[PDB]
Each structure stands twice: as C-alpha cells, then as structure tokens.
Design a binder for this molecule. Structure first.
Ligand SMILES: [Mg+2]
Ligand SMILES: [Mg+2]
Ligand SMILES: [Mg+2]
Ligand SMILES: [Zn+2]
Lengths: 128, 125, 136, 37
RNA sequence: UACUAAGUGGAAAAGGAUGUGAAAGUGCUAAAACAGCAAGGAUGUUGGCUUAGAAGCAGCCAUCGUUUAAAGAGUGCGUAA
C-alpha cells in the first residue's frame, strides 16, 4: 500500500512504483483516463500495492483549507490565532462540506459542517 | 463508580429486553477504517455494532431472564450486534464483510427468543 | 552581582549563621519555595549563578522573587602575609542564611517546571535545600 | 560504561538494577551504561 | 523484645539508589486490579504557512475536530520529506 503524489495532468513518471512490480506502462492509461474531469488540479492516488498485480487504485480530493482561503478572499491567513482577519458564513461552509463529503469518513453532514469550523479555527477564520 | 455501573447495566438490559436480535463477534484483525466502513454500510438505526464488556453483558443477560448464551460469553472476545425489526439483512451484511476480511471467528448469538449454533449462524444469513 | 551601593563601615564583624530562623521563614510572595536546612555563608556569586539558572529554566510568563540579599561583606588578607598590621580589605559580599530561611520562590508556571527550577537553584548553593509550598 | 558518583536514568527505557551490591543502569542503548552509583 | 547483613559497628561531605523495618493517608480490584500475552491503535490529510521538503514525529499558525472501544496534528525509531 502506497499513498503516492501524482499530478492529474502529469502522472506517467514515478520510479517507486517499478520497485514493487506494477506494470507502469499499461497502467498509465488508467491513471490518466478518470482524471480528465479535474484537469489541472493536483490529485493524489492510493495504491493497493500487492503481488496479485491487478492493482486497484483510488483517486483523492485536493487537500482542505485552500477553499477556505478562496472563500475568505485572502491569500494567506493570519500569523496569530488571536488576530482574526477572515470571516466565513454557513453557506460557504456547507458548500465545502458537501464537496468534501467524498473523502471524509463521517456518517452525517453536520459532522462535516463542524469540520469546516475545525479547520477554520486552525486557520483563524471566525465562524459567522 | 458503582452508581454509573448500576445505571449502565440497567439501560443495556432494557435495550436487550426491547430488542429482537443479537449476534456476537470478535475483534481480531480488522482496521478502524474498516470499522467506520461497517458503520456507514449498515446506516440503519436498528442495526448497531458496539464493544461491550464481557462482565456487563453476562450481568445484563441475567436480568434478561434468558438462558443458554453463557457458553458464548466464556473465555472469549465478545461483540454485540443488536438489530431491530429485520435482522436477516444485518446478518447478511456482516457475513459478506467477514468473507471480504482476511480472518475472523464468529460466536453464537441470540434471536427471536431462541439460540443458534455456529453452523446455524452460517445459514441464518 | 548583588552589591550594596554604599556601606557605613567597610570592615564589619562577621555575622553568625548558627541559630534558628529570623524572618524569611515562610513563603509569602510565591507559593513554592526553596528552604535551607544548614546555615552557611553564601556569596553574591552563588546568588547570580542560582538566579541565572532559574531564569534559563523558567518560561515566558513565570515570575520569581529573591528573598536573601548579601548585606554583609567579608575580608581576606593577601597571600604570603604574616599575621598583624591590621585587618584585610573587603573581598566578597555574603548573605547570611540560617536554618529555615526561604531563599528563592517561584510562581505562575506549572508545578513540574517550578519543582525542577528550584532543584537547579539549590544545586548551585552549598546549603542543603528543601521544597515547601504556601499555606492556603 | 560510564563510572559516575551519581547514576540516574537518561531515557525512559533505562532501568536501575542492583548487582553484586553495586547499583548500575542498563538500557538498550549501550552509551547509557552507568556504574558506581 | 525488636533492628542491621554492611564486619556496618570499627572515621568522613555535596550527591545518587526498587536495601530493609515501622507508621499515618489516599486510588482500583472476585461488576476483576497491575505486569505480561493476543488484537485493534482511525478518517478528513499528508490540515495550512513554512522549509529545496516535512504532510502523525524541522521552526511553526496553532497545538483541530468527527466515527468510535480506542486513537495523539502522535511514542519514539526512522524516511531528503
Ligand atoms: Mg570501618
Ligand atoms: Mg532507596
Ligand atoms: Mg524506608
Ligand atoms: Zn538509555
């Protein structure tokens, strides 16, 4: 099992895979085939590295707290937790939650709601 | 303390009194990611997987005026899988998952005021 | 180096450290304190070593008090000098610590750092130290 | 082995024992063997 | 009647130590104690600045939250990371 970082538009390289015996050249088409709906965005892949050779792969969502920056209309958050700069309402928070529900292992949607507050507290954005 | 233990035994005894199906499982070699997956695949309030204490389960069983389950809860690792209304689909789901697992034991449970054996659990799915 | 700004008399008689505890007996500014179990003469050099030790092992918000002060001076005749021809010149300043005087106290940081801080302060001093807390 | 007048554990794995009426410190790391406690 | 296992007695300090005896309190325990053994020990994610890079284990912005029995922005080792 390997959590490897590959660009969505450029995933053909990577020597580490070759150490396990994965058929890299046959599988390059599979890597590129199902990521064209999210071109440009960086999308890592989880690989079920094993000796069966029928390596099932799963894509993964871009890491969180960059859409928090986008919604806060600021490039980089405050360098002090006490200092509050960005403000985010519940509507922008809920759009992020339903977007990020795919990668999250929470059963309910309110659990995903309070994930946005949790990363925003780390980011320093007041939850209004 | 003792009062919390008394409260705990009372409520679990009430839950198993108002329930209709129970099955016991072990906690040998399955991941927490897999544990969250089982919770989401069930997604039914009637179906509930829980880690119970072996001692607390027997004492709640004494208060439930049932018999014969004692052999299950002796020198073993115990899970509780309570099902409300329909339990066949819950048993079918858990059976499919253990087949998807690597290794697993499976200990006798309780349903419909009757008890079963290991092979009887194999056919209850 | 703690030192009195001026003194009326350069060469005073030495002050005994034998006896019980006159003042500075109970923690009254902080709430943990470094008590002594053996009266001895300790000089301003040991205070500065102990104070610097506490400050280095302190945090960003801890606060400390220094109770004892080296009021009394001591002299030392120059080497290779035969007895006579008056008393020697003052050399070093010493604080008189009796059995039971609280030397250092600390507050406003968790207990473990304070216990450790008092330990490093007491290893710099000749007296046999002991930890005490403040009465409620 | 380090011979010191005072011996104390260096890492949480160091364990104090008393062998041949002498207290020593043994540990997985051989740089932390102490004696003459 | 107790104590010492050091020939202490029959010379010594700062400091160090699961030597041993006595006493006074406090926590859990046959609704199971402690050690050990057998299992799991998570997700967002590898959070984000930051750093060539750190993303469980460089300094940080701090020192998140759910599922859940439990899980830590991790316990270390360790990986350029
Ligand atoms: Mg002798
Ligand atoms: Mg001892
Ligand atoms: Mg004793
Ligand atoms: Zn060690």
């Amino acid at each position: 099992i390997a959590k490897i970082n590959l660009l969505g538009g450029q995933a053909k390289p990577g020597p580490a895979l070759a150490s396990v015996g994965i058929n890299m050249g046959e599988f390059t088409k599979q890597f590129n085939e199902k990521t064209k709906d999210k071109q440009g965005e960086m999308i890592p892949c989880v690989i079920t590295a094993y000796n069966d050779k029928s390596f099932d792969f799963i894509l993964k969502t871009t890491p969180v707290s960059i859409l928090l920056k986008q919604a806060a209309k600021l490039e980089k958050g405050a360098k002090n937790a006490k200092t509050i700069v960005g403000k985010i309402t519940m509507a922008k928070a809920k759009e992020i939650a339903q977007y990020k529900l795919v990668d999250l292992n929470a059963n309910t949607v309110e659990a995903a709601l309070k994930m946005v507050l949790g990363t925003a507290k780390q980011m320093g954005i007041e939850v209004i | 303390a003792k009062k919390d233990k008394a409260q705990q035994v009372a409520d679990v005894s009430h839950l198993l009194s108002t329930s209709a199906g129970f099955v016991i499982f072990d906690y040998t070699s399955m991941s927490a990611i897999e544990a969250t997956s089982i919770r989401k695949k069930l997604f039914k309030n009637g179906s509930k997987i829980k880690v119970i204490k072996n001692n607390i389960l027997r004492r709640a069983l004494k208060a439930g005026k049932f018999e014969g389950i004692d052999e299950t809860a002796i020198k073993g690792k115990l899970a509780v899988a309570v099902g409300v209304n329909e339990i066949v689909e819950t048993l079918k789901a858990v059976d499919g998952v253990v087949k998807a697992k690597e290794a697993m034991n499976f200990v006798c449970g309780y349903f419909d005021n009757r008890a079963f054996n290991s092979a009887d659990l194999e056919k209850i799915a | 180096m703690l030192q009195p700004k001026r003194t009326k008399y350069r060469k005073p008689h030495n002050v005994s450290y034998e006896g019980k505890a006159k003042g500075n007996s109970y923690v009254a500014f902080g709430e943990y304190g470094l008590v002594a179990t053996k009266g001895n003469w300790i000089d301003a050099r040991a205070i500065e070593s102990a104070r610097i030790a506490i400050s280095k092992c302190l945090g960003k918000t801890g606060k400390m008090w220094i109770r004892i002060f080296p009021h009394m001076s001591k002299t030392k005749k120059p080497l290779e000098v035969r007895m006579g021809s008056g008393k020697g010149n003052p050399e070093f300043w010493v604080a008189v610590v009796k059995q039971g005087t609280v030397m250092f106290e600390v507050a406003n940081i968790p207990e473990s750092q304070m216990i450790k801080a008092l330990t490093r302060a007491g290893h710099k001093l000749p007296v046999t130290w002991k930890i005490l807390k403040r009465e409620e | 082995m380090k011979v010191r007048a005072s011996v104390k554990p260096i890492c949480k794995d160091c364990k104090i024992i008393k062998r041949h009426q002498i207290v020593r410190v043994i540990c997985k790391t051989q740089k932390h063997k102490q004696r003459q406690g």
